[PDB]
């Protein structure tokens, strides 16, 4: 659904039928990435280095192992991302997640994993 309706598709008679929603697309949700790690931030005993917002532009990183600085590509395209284990690459939206232009991977829920796998090992 692209009309921004996700009410009245939930009383169960269409919620059972397959539907997929997680689209941000950018403007417009940051709960699926920026502050999906806020829960996995710091208050509780487990050590996490940063989740903290910068000057008003999202540059989400895990300074422990997962540095994937969220940036914009130079004008003519949008989104640039860094990687510590495979160098930088250009990225762009495809469904409102930031999708790899290599073959399509999304760091939306991956960085969520990395934070709570950085205290396990």
């Amino acid at each position: 659904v692209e009309s921004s309706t996700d009410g009245q598709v939930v009383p169960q008679e269409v919620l059972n039928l397959p539907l997929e929603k997680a689209h941000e697309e950018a403007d417009d949700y940051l709960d699926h990435l920026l502050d999906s790690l806020e829960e996995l931030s710091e208050a509780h005993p487990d050590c996490i280095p940063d989740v903290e917002l910068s000057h008003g532009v999202m540059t989400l990183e895990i300074p422990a192992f997962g540095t994937y600085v969220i940036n914009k590509q130079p004008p003519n395209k949008q989104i640039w991302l860094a990687s510590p284990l495979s160098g930088p690459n250009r990225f762009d939206l495809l469904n409102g997640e930031w999708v790899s232009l290599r073959n399509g991977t999304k760091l939306t829920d991956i960085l969520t994993e990395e934070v709570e796998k950085a205290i396990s090992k």
Binding site: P45, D46, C47, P49, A64, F65, A118, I119
Partner: peptide, 8 residues
């Protein structure tokens, strides 16, 4: 250095 991470 690396995050193991010991909380104690």
């Amino acid at each position: 250095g690396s995050h193991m991470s010991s909380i104690t």
